[PDB]
Amino acid sequence: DTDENLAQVEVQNKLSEVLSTLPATVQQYGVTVSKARSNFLMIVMLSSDVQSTEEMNDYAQRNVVPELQRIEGVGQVRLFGAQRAMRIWVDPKKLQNYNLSFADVGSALSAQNIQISAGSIGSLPAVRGQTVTATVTAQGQLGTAEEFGNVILRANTDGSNIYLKDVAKVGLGMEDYSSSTRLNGVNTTGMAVMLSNSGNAMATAKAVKERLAVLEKYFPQGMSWKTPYDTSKFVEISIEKVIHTLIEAMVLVFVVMYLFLQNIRYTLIPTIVVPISLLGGFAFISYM
Amino acid sequence: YPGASAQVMEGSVLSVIERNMNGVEGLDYMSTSADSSGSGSVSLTFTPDTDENLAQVEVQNKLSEVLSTLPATVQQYGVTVSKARSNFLMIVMLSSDVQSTEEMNDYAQRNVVPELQRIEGVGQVRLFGAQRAMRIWVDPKKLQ
Amino acid sequence: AEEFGNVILRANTDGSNIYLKDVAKVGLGMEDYSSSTRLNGVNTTGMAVMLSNSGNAMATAKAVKERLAVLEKYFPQGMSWKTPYDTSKFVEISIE
Amino acid sequence: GMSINVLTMFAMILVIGIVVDDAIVVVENVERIMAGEGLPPKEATKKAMGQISGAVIGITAVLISVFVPLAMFSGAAGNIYKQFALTMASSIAFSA
Amino acid sequence: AGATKERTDATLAQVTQLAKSIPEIENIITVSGFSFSGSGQNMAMGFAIFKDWNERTASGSDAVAVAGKLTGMMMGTLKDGFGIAVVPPPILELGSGLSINLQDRNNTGHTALLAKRNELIQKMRASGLFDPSTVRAGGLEDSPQLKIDINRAAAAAQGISFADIRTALASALSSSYVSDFPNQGRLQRVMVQADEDARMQPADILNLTVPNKSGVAVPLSTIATVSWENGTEQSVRFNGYPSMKLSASPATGVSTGQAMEAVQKMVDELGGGYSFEWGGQSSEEAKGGSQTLILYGLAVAAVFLVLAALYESWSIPLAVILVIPLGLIGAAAGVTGRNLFEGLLGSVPSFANDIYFQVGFVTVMGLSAKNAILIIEFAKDLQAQGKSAVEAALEAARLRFRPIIMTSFAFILGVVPLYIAAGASSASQRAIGTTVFWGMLVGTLLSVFLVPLFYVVVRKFF
Amino acid sequence: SPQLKIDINRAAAAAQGISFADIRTALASALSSSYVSDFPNQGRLQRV
C-alpha cells in the first residue's frame, strides 16, 4: 500500500534523531534519505570538445539541480562523476622535512580560509541624530588555487614562511575520482534520471528532453546533449501499435460484416458503434 | 546571520539550502531573498494542488540534512520552516502606560505562543519587535 | 544584570579582579532593535496573526479576539488590547 | 466542503427569481386554467399539470445544462467560477 | 540609501501627521523596519485604516481617493522619503503586480547582470511593445558599503589568524550570542555587542584591537584598508539563478500578449546566455480570461445537447442557441452604457469584462435560453396540430407572454438592489448588478419579439 | 579482498607514542582525504 509521503519522512524522523552519534566526518558529509525507484528512465550523455569531463561535471551540476530535479515525475537524478573541489595533494616527505604533518595543513586551511561576517555602521541601537547605516564587508575566503598555495603552515622567526605551495600540489580537482563514464569509447559524462513513485515514462522523459533543449541555449558552446537511453520511445511504439492494430481489427470486422450483411447501410453502423463504446471505456479509464 | 551582508548571507547560508530544495515534491518554483538586516529567506511555492502537510516536512527534511554545513552562528540561531500565507488577518495593538515597549514585548511573548498559536486557523503569529535579552555593551577602549 | 557585571574577565595576582562592571554596560535589553511599531503616533506593540492554508477569517478572528479577552484578565494591569485591523468585520458585512 | 463565498450568495440572489420561475410558470398556468378551463381548484390543477409539466421540465434541464461547465475550470478564477456554478447547480436541482 | 531609524521615524511621523489630516481615516499604524520591497532602516510602511463605510459617503471618500489624496500630500510635503499610498487587491493576493525575473544563465558578474537588468528596463521603456509607465526595478536599494581589504602578508608577518579577525568584527558590530540565562522563569538570550560610540564611526572600524597570538592587542589600521564602495542590500536568487525584479505593463488599453511576446526577444538581445521568467500577483490570475471559448464551447454544446435530448429533434436547439447573442448585446450595452453614464458627472467609470460580468452573463444566457425554450416548446406542440409556422409561433408567443414577463421582470426588478448597491464590495455587487439587469431587460425584450420569428425562420427551413 | 591490518599495541602509545586520535587523523587524511572547509568558486560554495 503505497504512501511514500508518510514513510520517507518517518525515515528522516529517525535519522534526524540519529545524525549526532554518527562519526564527525559522516555528519559533516551528511546522510541522505530518498524514496528511490532504482530503475533508470534515461541517460543524458553530455559530450564536448573544448570542455573536459571534470569541467562538464561542474556545469552539469548547474543545469541538473535547478532544472532537472524540478521537472515533474523525476524524484532523483544521479550524476556520473562528481562536482569539482579544491584538491590539495600534500607530499608526506616534504611534511617530515619541515617537521610538519597533515594536522598542520588542515588547521592552516581551517584558519586562513573562513567566512567572516562583520556588521554595520550606525546599526541599532544608534546614537541620536545618526545619519548613515552601512554594512561593512571583509573576505576571509580563498578563491583560487594560488591563494590556497600561499597559506601559511608555519611562520619562522627570521620572517620566512612555510607555504602550501612548497609542501603540496594545489589546484582544482574533483571530490571523487571513481566513476568513469564512456559513450562509444570517448570520455563523456551522462546524467541518469530516475522516476519517483508517481513517475511516468512518456510525459517525464518528454519533459526532461524538451527542458534540456532550452537549457542548451545557455550552455558554454561546444556542449552537446545526446539521449541514447530512452524508454519513452518504447511507449511511443505502443501507441503506434494500438492505432495500427485497432485499424487492422476494425477494417477486418467491417469486412466480415459487409460480406455477411451485403450492404453498406447495414455494415456502416456497427463500425460506428465501436469507437463510441471504446471511447466510453476510455472515459472510465481516466476516472479510475 | 547577524553580521552577514547581502552576499555573505546569500552565499554562506541561503544558497546552501536552495541546492537541496528542488528534490521536494511538486516544486513549482523557488526564490531567495537575502538582505543586509542579517536576515535571509528562500521561498518554495508549490503546484496548485494543495498539500502543505507533505511539502512543509519534505522541506524540513532537506533542511535537517543541511543545518550542519550552515555557519555556527546561524545553526545556533536556528533556521525555521513555515507554510505561510503572507497576508495579514489582523493586528492586536497592545498599549500601556506603566509598561514600556520592551516590557510589553516580554509579556507579549507570554500570551502569544501558549495561546495565540494554539488557536485553530492561525498558522503563524508575527510579533513586532523582539523578546528581551541580557544585552551587554562593552567599550572597546576599556578593552584595549 | 548585576551578577553579569561581576563576572571575572581576568584575575590579577595581587587579588584584584577585572569585572564586566568595569568594561561594559550590562542590563536587560532586546534581542533586536530594528522594528518600530506605532499606533496613531504613540509607541505601541502589536501582534500580527496570519492564516494557515486551512485558515478562516470570521471564525479565526472571532477566536483570537475572544481568547485575548480572557487573556487580559491575567495581564499586568494598565495593559489594554485594541484590534483596529480586522477583516472579520468585512465578512460580517457580507452576511448582513 | 466549500466555505460560503460571496458569489454563491449572488447566485441565490440572482437565482431566487429562477426558482420562482417554475413556481410562477405552474401557478400562472393553473391561474390561466382557473379562468380558462375555470374548474374547481383540483380539476383545474389536473388540467394544469397535464399541459405544463413537461414545459417546466424544459426550463429546469436547460438551466442545469448551461450552468455546469462554468465549474470545469481550475485555478484562482477557476475556484471562484466552480464555486458559483456548483451552488447554482445545486439550487436549480432542488428547485427542479 | 544610507538611511537610519531616526530619519525613518521622522518620515513616518510626517506620514502620521498627513494621515491624521484626513477625516476618513480612523486609525493609522506605522511600522519602521519593513516594506513590501524589503527590510532595513530605510524601509517602512503604514496601514491607514478608515472609519466606518457608512460615514465615508461622499465623492472623494473612497479608498482610492484617500490613497490619491494622501500620496499627493506626501509627494508634496514629505521630506527625505519616497512615500506612496496604494489600495489592496480584493482576493487573490490575500497594486498591479508585474514580476519579471531576469536571471543570468552564465557566471557573469553581478554588476553586469544588473547593468543588463537596467538595459532590459531601458529598452523596454523605449519600446512601445512594453507600454510606458509602470517601470520600476523591484527589490531593494544599492548602498555605499565599507570594504576591509586584509593582505595575508600582514597576517603572516605579525598578524593574527583570520578566525580571530572574524570574532573581532562580528562581536564588535553585529553582537555575539554567548549563552542562555534564566529570566523570570524563562531561558532568554545573553548577547555581547560593542558600544554605540564605537560600532558607528566608519573610521572606528580599524580602531578595534584584535588579539595577536602573543596576547597583543593590534588595531586593524596596521593590517587593513577600508574602501568606501557600493553594494546591493538585497540578493535575489530566482530558481537557483541570481535574478532581478523589473516592472512594465500593458493595462486597460493594450493586451498583454504582445508585450509578453516581445520581452523574450528582448532578453535574447543582450548576452544571449541570459534568461528571464515570470512571477506576479493578482494580475497574473487576471490573465485567465482567454480560456473563454472553451467555456462557451462547453456551454452551447451542453445546451444544444440537452435541448436535442428533451425536445427530440435538432431544429429547436438551433432555434434557441440563436437567442444567446440577444442577451449579450444587452449586457455589453449595459456595461458600456454605465461606463457612459458614470463618466459624465464626477466618477471614474470602472466597469469591465471582469469575473462578475462573466458569471452574471452566464446567468443571463441561461434565463434567455429558458425563455426561448418556453415559447418554442409550445409552438413545437402547435406545429403538430397542422397549425402553420407563423400561426403556431404567434399563438405560442400569445400564450407565454404573461409568464415570461412575470418571471423575467420579477428577476430584473430583483437585481435592482444589486444594481444600486453601495458600500462594501459594491464594485462587485454593481458589476454583476449592471450586466445582469440590462442584459436581462434588453435580453427579454429582444427575445420576446424575435423568438416567435426564430421558430418561423427555423421550421420553414427545417 | 586482501586487506592491510595495522596492529597498534598501546604499550608503544604509552611509552613514547601518541594518542589514538592523532593516529586516526594521520591515516585518514593520508589515505582517504580530509574535508576541511568550503571555498567560493565561480559563485558557488564548493569543497576543499
Residue numbers in the entry:
A (entry chain A): 97 to 384
B (entry chain A): 49 to 192
C (entry chain A): 241 to 336
D (entry chain A): 385 to 480
E (entry chain A): 577 to 670, 673 to 1040
F (entry chain A): 721 to 768
From the article:
This powerful efflux complex spans the entire cell envelope of N. gonorrhoeae and mediates the export of hydrophobic antimicrobial agents, such as antibiotics, nonionic detergents, antibacterial peptides, bile salts and gonadal steroidal hormones.
For the MtrCDE tripartite efflux system, MtrD is a large proton-motive-force (PMF)-dependent inner membrane HAE-RND efflux pump composed of 1,067 amino acids. It appears that the opening and closing of the MtrE channel may be induced by the change in conformation of the MtrC membrane fusion protein, which propagates the progressive motion of the MtrD multidrug efflux pump within the transport cycle to the MtrE channel.
